[PDB]
Design a protein around this ligand. Structure first.
Ligand code: HEM
Ligand code: ZN
Length: 119
């Protein structure tokens, strides 16, 4: 594909499975793919932002916090940005969730699967 901005559908999968993750409820698909100089960046909206305290994706054999490129405090959402390579390969990610009022404090591994062909 060539430089520009595109819609890309995706699903978040439970770690090491083809099952839909509980996290899938809290992301917006499609995400936005920016292609720039042969590199691919994904901008993804997280819902219930206040609950999601960390979000990381695999980068160079390690995990890195995705950049927050915008926040909407009124909507309680935010947009995070990270690099993808092969849009047909699963991307490993990590999430930390904290809901003080429900005593829910966990962190998880998940996979993101993009589907470039989907509309
Ligand atoms: C808000 C109320 C929430 C409740 C009641 C809840 C409940 C649960 C429960 C019971 C499980 C065990 C597996 C299952 O039953 O499906 C689970 C796992 C999991 N939850 Fe939560 N959760 C909540 C919020 C969130 C949020 C905001 C995220 C954002 C990432 C999240 C991500 C996950 C992940 C990644 C797992 C591991 C299994 C999977 O990937 O589906 N959850 N959750
Ligand atoms: Zn846990």
């Amino acid at each position: 594909l060539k430089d520009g901005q595109y819609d890309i559908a995706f699903k978040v999968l439970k770690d090491k499975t083809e099952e839909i993750s509980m996290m899938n409820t809290y992301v917006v698909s499609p995400a936005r793919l920016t292609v720039k100089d042969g590199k691919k960046y994904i901008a993804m909206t997280l819902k219930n932002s206040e609950w999601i305290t960390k979000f990381q994706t695999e980068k160079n054999g390690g995990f890195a916090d995705a950049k927050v490129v915008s926040e909407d405090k009124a909507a309680n959402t935010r947009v995070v940005e990270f690099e993808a390579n092969d849009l047909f390969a699963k991307l490993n990610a990590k999430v930390k969730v904290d809901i003080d009022s429900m005593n829910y404090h966990h962190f998880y591994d998940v996979q993101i699967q993009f589907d470039p062909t989907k509309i």
